[PDB]
Design a protein around this ligand. Sequence first.
Ligand SMILES: *[C@@H]1O[C@H](CO)[C@@H](O[C@@H]2O[C@H](CO)[C@@H](O)[C@H](O)[C@H]2NC(C)=O)[C@H](O)[C@H]1NC(C)=O
Ligand SMILES: *[C@@H]1O[C@H](CO)[C@@H](O[C@@H]2O[C@H](CO)[C@@H](O)[C@H](O)[C@H]2NC(C)=O)[C@H](O)[C@H]1NC(C)=O
Ligand SMILES: *[C@@H]1O[C@H](CO)[C@@H](O[C@@H]2O[C@H](CO)[C@@H](O)[C@H](O)[C@H]2NC(C)=O)[C@H](O)[C@H]1NC(C)=O
Ligand SMILES: *[C@@H]1O[C@H](CO)[C@@H](O)[C@H](O)[C@H]1NC(C)=O
Ligand SMILES: OC[C@H]1O[C@@H](O)[C@H](O)[C@@H](O)[C@H]1O
Ligand SMILES: [Ca+2]
Length: 640
Amino acid sequence: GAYVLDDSDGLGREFDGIGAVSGGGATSRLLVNYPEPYRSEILDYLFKPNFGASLHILKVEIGGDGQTTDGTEPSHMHYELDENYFRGYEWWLMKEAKKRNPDIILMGLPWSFPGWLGKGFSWPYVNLQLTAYYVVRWILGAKHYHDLDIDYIGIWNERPFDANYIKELRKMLDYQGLQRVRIIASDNLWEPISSSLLLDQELWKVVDVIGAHYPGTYTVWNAKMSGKKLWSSEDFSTINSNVGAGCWSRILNQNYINGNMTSTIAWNLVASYYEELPYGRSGLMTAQEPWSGHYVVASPIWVSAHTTQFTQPGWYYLKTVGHLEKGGSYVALTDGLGNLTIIIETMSHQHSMCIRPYLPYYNVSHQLATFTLKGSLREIQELQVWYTKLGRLHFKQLDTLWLLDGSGSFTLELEEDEIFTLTTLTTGRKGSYPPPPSSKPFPTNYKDDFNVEYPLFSEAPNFADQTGVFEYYMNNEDREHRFTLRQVLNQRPITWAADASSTISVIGDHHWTNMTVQCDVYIETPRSGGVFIAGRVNKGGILIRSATGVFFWIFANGSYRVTADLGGWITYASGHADVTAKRWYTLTLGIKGYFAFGMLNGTILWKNVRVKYPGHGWAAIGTHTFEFAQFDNFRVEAAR
Ligand SMILES: *[C@@H]1O[C@H](CO)[C@@H](O[C@@H]2O[C@H](CO)[C@@H](O)[C@H](O)[C@H]2NC(C)=O)[C@H](O)[C@H]1NC(C)=O
Ligand SMILES: *[C@@H]1O[C@H](CO)[C@@H](O[C@@H]2O[C@H](CO)[C@@H](O)[C@H](O)[C@H]2NC(C)=O)[C@H](O)[C@H]1NC(C)=O
Ligand SMILES: *[C@@H]1O[C@H](CO)[C@@H](O[C@@H]2O[C@H](CO)[C@@H](O)[C@H](O)[C@H]2NC(C)=O)[C@H](O)[C@H]1NC(C)=O
Ligand SMILES: *[C@@H]1O[C@H](CO)[C@@H](O)[C@H](O)[C@H]1NC(C)=O
Ligand SMILES: OC[C@H]1O[C@@H](O)[C@H](O)[C@@H](O)[C@H]1O
Ligand SMILES: [Ca+2]
């Protein structure tokens, strides 16, 4: 009926910020090649203060060369003795975020690791000092090459922690002058990290934040007892429809109310990956068409604004937060400087389901709520008002509220699926850019000759690696193939996902069904080496081992094979071919209806081979195992 807001008995917990994840894996892949001004506009909707999502926190994957949900991300150390701090796109992203908001909080976390760290095993805890050296290199590089201060470092995403590793990581950080870097653990469930902190004083000292994933707004007794900051260090992961926006709205409030969690971080930041990859369109907004420039400022962007534009890390929650009599919730925060922000949501069960976990039904119905400002809040006469209605009206500023009658009280009519932000702050703004170009399919005629002498990014645009890692490569000693694309992994990573046994990068339009793919290929490994080109590739990401399609393989022992699957269990055709290592060949693969054909150097190798139909999927290139190979003059023409 009447809800009292008051700071007289003191304050709740310190608010640490709202953020999002870029990574786990290759979620920002297609953002980098957006033409201006659209690329920069997207970044503004995400990071510019008092504009759009105005994020307080950016968490990135520390690429480990393994598949990590929608692709692989390149490591700074592919091999022992290798160091390169300019691969991939996380450095660029962190810098773009920092330019817009210098006070943004930066976090890094590994999902996979390069295989060499395992010293023979697929395990990162074989040599604790070596693994810690690898991670700390990344942090130092962020500073030395990009002027980035990494604020938080994690352990091993959704995988076991080793208490001794965590201790060694703290030692190593301090030893390299990174005492300011804080450690969050263990990016999994509340246990066993929470109980481990109670049983081990030395571990307790080195862990600054307990970060749990998909907690369903709740925590556990051992975590409260630890006295540590508690973050939902990964949450959301729901399609950015109105339903997704409701889920985000509800957990933003209730993670603190129900679970004492003072930060929530959404996976993922922006859906810049092919939608038919796992968890498609599960970012705060959508930018999956760099070829057209089309992007969508999705609902969760404005849901974010309701908190992020009106709070900052370092504000405090009030003791006075809770649930509404007839459903929904309210939180309230101050800055200690007389400001006050009040965030109210009334998300109905049917329009706010997250994918993890699914909540049993709860009722929400029309209600009236009366708020009274006791303590030092009483001295406030006036509030700005922001309003959103999901279903749709977004981040609409309403008429200022006045409490001049000395009552220190006000009342609201609340329906379902609504958010209200009531704040003293005047700085609010629904940021706006002109609409971007209409959506368009991937170009039905496409080519890349990779002839770029000084590329801005380490890989050609639109190629999304799903196992292995592909990079621009310059070979001066050859004039006919001076600039190519090269697969650079020579051993399987310490994997997070189930990476394929063959490397593969996909590109184009998953809807494609009739297509002709061509590429010059070059096998580097004598006797045992092999490469392929492919069409109708129907799965990737964490499901990359499941991929079917039409795969045209050639091998350095003078053979070829046509398969239905990436795993090569199912044969469409096979035979001999004049193919050896260290020689350039042109491969052509044509697929139409029930039939396919393959060419070697313009000459037919196999023809009218029956394949499964109907079928559809991307084009692709790859290598038989984790082995060096080069590709050049890529072409695809397709019909959707
Ligand atoms: C964690 O938050 C919970 C609320 O989700 C706090 O638990 C109590 O909440 C009830 C209402 O649900 C209040 O009446 C009590 O005052 C709260 N307990 C106490 C001790 O104040 C709990 O306080 C929080 N735990 C912390 C801050 O460690
Ligand atoms: C509300 O928050 C604003 C934002 O910080 C406060 O305004 C700042 O106040 C500090 C010192 O109090 C000044 O140094 C800054 O120049 C102010 N900035 C702006 C943009 O005003 C403000 O004090 C808070 N309280 C009220 C009542 O507005
Ligand atoms: C892909 O190619 C197949 C094979 O020709 C096309 O299927 C044929 O389409 C014609 C005219 O549309 C029909 O008369 C045939 O009966 C179809 N054949 C089969 C086996 O279905 C298909 O339409 C093409 N698809 C695209 C998107 O271009
Ligand atoms: C929800 O609550 C309202 C009012 O309390 C009631 O009229 C309605 O029947 C309830 N709906 C369900 C599904 O329980
Ligand atoms: O919900 C999808 C997400 O699930 C998490 O377990 C993981 O950390 C993310 O990379 C992504 O896969
Ligand atoms: Ca070239």
